[PDB]
Amino acid sequence: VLACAIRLFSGNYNWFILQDNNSNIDSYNYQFLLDTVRYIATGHRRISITQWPMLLATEPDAGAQLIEPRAEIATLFNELKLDLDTVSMIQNWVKHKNGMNDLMYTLHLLFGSVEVID
Amino acid sequence: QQLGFELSRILKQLPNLGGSDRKTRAMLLANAVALQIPFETLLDFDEQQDKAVAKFKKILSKVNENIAVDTKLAVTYFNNILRIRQSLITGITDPCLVKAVLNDYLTVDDVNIVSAVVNGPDYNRIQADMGNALNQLIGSID
Amino acid sequence: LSRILKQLPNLGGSDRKTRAMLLANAVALQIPFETLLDFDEQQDKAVAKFKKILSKVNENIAVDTKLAVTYFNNILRIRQSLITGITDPCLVKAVLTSDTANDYLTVDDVNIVSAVVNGPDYNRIQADMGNALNQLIGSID
Amino acid sequence: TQVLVMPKAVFESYKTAGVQFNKLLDTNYIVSETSVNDLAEIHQALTAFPFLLPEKLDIKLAVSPIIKVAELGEIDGPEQFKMKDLHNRLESRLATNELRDAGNRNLVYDYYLYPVDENLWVAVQQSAHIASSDPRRVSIQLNHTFFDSMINEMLNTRPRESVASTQIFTYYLESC
Amino acid sequence: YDIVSTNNQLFDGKLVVIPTRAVQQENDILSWGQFFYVSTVIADLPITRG
Amino acid sequence: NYNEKSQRDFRVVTIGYNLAASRQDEFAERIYPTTVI
Structure with a gap:
């Protein structure tokens, strides 16, 4: 799982920081990315890893600003005093008690064969 | 005359004591073969060892058709003797070998005895000081 | 240089002969013989460098330079025989029971080598195996 | 534990001869079963x-x-x-x-x-590789299977969360 | 032969001679017995016992 | 305090306590050599 995470998260720039535009602006996909970065920093998430899969697959338009309306994926790394290095963030990811379990779920949700509603 | 039979015929001539016989039997095969096999010029030590051992084990397989030899012990001795041979060709040659092969009369024991009595450096420590005290010269020149 | 040379005890008239041996080893340790070549080009280079090194014996105390070359040339030829392989019991004994061999062998291993090498019939048996191998070592795939 | 680095040549002697690996930290045993050169x-x-x-x-x-x-x-x-x-x-x-x-x-x-x-x-020192430019990074990439072997073993006794904070764990991630 | 001593009370007056392989190896069946060991589990839980 | 004979500040010496950790004692290890599962 660790070798997989690095292969997928290893680019010229921090992968999460690159995800600060695209189509994900106020989506649950964006709130997920912000929630994942907070986990790496603190170890605590607003929505359980076992609840994100159904929320992301449906991607409701109801309300995503209720999770984190203020922060942006780029700003969490400076506010939370994280290291943008790919290796540093993976180590800070897995060192948490539920690290490898959260990582396996995240890899599935971002890179796996998720059934997404059209 | 298969090599396995000829080596076995010769080994039968060693004096017997008891179970110690397998230690001295294995040692002699290791000594003869480790020193007899020629080295190939294109190989480094790592490869020369793998090749020399492969042949040594095959020799034991043939010998063990005639006379019992402990395979693991004989290989242990073989590798030790082979490393000594490799060290001599790349490393320091003992003065007993220059003496044995070549007016040479006063031997190393003769100076190591005096050093031991006075509790000073022996021949080997002086030899180490020589090279060390010479390291700078040889490295500087070519 | 002279500090360590003065560590060698004086022994009769051999003071100029033992240091010649020590110097020949000191150089031969750090000039290797490249297995790639035969005993002419690499040999001449090693000897030429040794003779050039002898140009600084004025810094030393008691070096017989003519004998030091003799010892150096003997080292190279001995190494040639070891590369090609040796069987002569007179040289095999010298290798097996030596200051180098006592550093690669354990105490128990030496005790065994000393039991075979010093046997009353070692020289005959070792010579016979030398011929048994020299004639047939190539038969082993 | 305690890591004991030895060349491949010494390790293969121990395994072939049948030297008890357990007692290689006891000076009185290793000197009896080990040659002067091997010890050096x-x-x-x-x-x-x-x-x-x-x-x-x-x-x-x-x-x-x-x-x-x-x-x-x-x-x-x-x-x-x-x-x-x-x-x-x-x-x-x-x-x-x-x-x-x-x-x-x-x-x-x-x-x-x-x-x-x-x-x-026991850490067996095997084949050498030539490395002059950034040999630290080259050493890390070469020893991938050494780093994960250490991690596998210490996770048998040490907590996973603690091992994750070591430099050995980091070196694994840097290699792959 | 080799000598192994214990201080266990169950050997108050016993000497037992057993064979083993002269050279030890890993998972060697020729040892008189074997100790099949799995890393002892150390489990740290804030149990609310009682 | 005519006499000030020391009563409190004594020289304190700590007795060592150093246990040896292993999978088996030498006796058991020699009879039942360890195999890792």
Whole structure:
């Protein structure tokens, strides 16, 4: 799982920081990315890893600003005093008690064969 | 005359004591073969060892058709003797070998005895000081 | 240089002969013989460098330079025989029971080598195996 | 545990001869089953071990046999003087090796981990590789299978969360 | 032969001679017995016992 | 305090306590050599 995470998260720039535009602006996909970065920093998430899969697959338009309306994926790394290095963030990811379990779920949700509603 | 039979015929001539016989039997095969096999010029030590051992084990397989030899012990001795041979060709040659092969009369024991009595450096420590005290010269020149 | 040379005890008239041996080893340790070549080009280079090194014996105390070359040339030829392989019991004994061999062998291993090498019939048996191998070592795939 | 780095040549001797690996930290056993050159090479291989072990997890690098011999030569007992003679032989043989392999200079080794109990981590020093430009990064990439072997073993006793914070865990991630 | 001593009370007056392989190896069946060991589990839980 | 004979500040010496950790004692290890599962 660790070798997989690095292969997928290893680019010229921090992968999460690159995800600060695209189509994900106020989506649950964006709130997920912000929630994942907070986990790496603190170890605590607003929505359980076992609840994100159904929320992301449906991607409701109801309300995503209720999770984190203020922060942006780029700003969490400076506010939370994280290291943008790919290796540093993976180590800070897995060192948490539920690290490898959260990582396996995240890899599935971002890179796996998720059934997404059209 | 298969090599396995000829080596076995010769080994039968060693004096017997008891179970110690397998230690001295294995040692002699290791000594003869480790020193007899020629080295190939294109190989480094790592490869020369793998090749020399492969042949040594095959020799034991043939010998063990005639006379019992402990395979693991004989290989242990073989590798030790082979490393000594490799060290001599790349490393320091003992003065007993220059003496044995070549007016040479006063031997190393003769100076190591005096050093031991006075509790000073022996021949080997002086030899180490020589090279060390010479390291700078040889490295500087070519 | 002279500090360590003065560590060698004086022994009769051999003071100029033992240091010649020590110097020949000191150089031969750090000039290797490249297995790639035969005993002419690499040999001449090693000897030429040794003779050039002898140009600084004025810094030393008691070096017989003519004998030091003799010892150096003997080292190279001995190494040639070891590369090609040796069987002569007179040289095999010298290798097996030596200051180098006592550093690669354990105490128990030496005790065994000393039991075979010093046997009353070692020289005959070792010579016979030398011929048994020299004639047939190539038969082993 | 305690990591004991030894060349492949020494490791294969131990395995072929059948030397108890458990008692290689006991000076009195290793000197009986180990040649003077092997003991010197173990010292040299320890001094060429580039990696910093997780001291925070009580994983230490073994003290070389030469130091242990030197210490016993200064301690009263029935074998003190035999141990002093061994020390002198080790120093002369070590200096002889250092004068011969000084040319090695710019290279890094592959290491193989052979766990022996929980108090000894045999680290076999295998084939050398040439590395002059950033040999630290080259050493890390080469020893991928050494880093994950160490991680697998310490996760048997140490907590996963603690191992994740070590430099050994980091080196694995940097390699892959 | 080799000598191994214990201080266990169950050997109050016993000497038992058993064969083993002269050279030890890993998972060697020729040892008189074997100790099949799995890393002792150390489990740290804030149990609310009682 | 005519006499000040020391009563409180004594020389304190700590007795060592150093246990040896292993999978087996030498006796058991020699009879039942360890195999890792």
